[PDB]
């Protein structure tokens, strides 16, 4: 039999579940924060 490993080195990133879920947290945060700080600075401007 032939086992072909066409995984591209993801065996060697350790604790992949938490690592994946870090990356996803930091895009959702960085987006969500910057969407709220955007909306509020365009209701300040609209009041002043």
């Amino acid at each position: 039999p032939v086992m072909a490993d066409l995984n591209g080195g993801l065996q060697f990133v350790p604790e992949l579940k938490e690592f994946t879920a870090k990356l996803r947290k930091e895009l959702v945060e960085t987006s969500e924060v910057r969407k709220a700080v955007s909306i509020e600075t365009a209701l300040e401007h609209k009041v002043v």
């Binding site: 945060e29 924060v33 600075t41 209701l43 300040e44 009041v47 002043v48």
Partner: protein, 132 residues
Amino acid sequence: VGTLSRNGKPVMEVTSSFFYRGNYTDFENTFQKTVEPVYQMHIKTSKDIAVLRSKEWFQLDDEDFDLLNKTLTFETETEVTFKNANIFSSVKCFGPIKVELPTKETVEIGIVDYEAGASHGNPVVDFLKRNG
């Protein structure tokens, strides 16, 4: 606002409001100090803390202070000179930010320190009406 004092301590405040009927266009000699209602924000998330750090007018005594899951009260007065009926020639909105402790006693952690020239509104009280 009259303040009656005996032996150099306040006893009571008299608050009379008069009204000259007529037609005035004298907005250079006009002003209004209101004391706004006390606004309460529950800081749940880390965007709530970031939206608040956005605001130039949210001064903190220690900028490293942890806001997360704390409850904040904004005790705010706003002084306001005029230009016309609708446009303020100056806005000021100040007074202390307080955090609820686990006793339910509140304690001053911060200041509000909004200033401005020409303005069609007070952005602080708008922010706290929606968010608080």
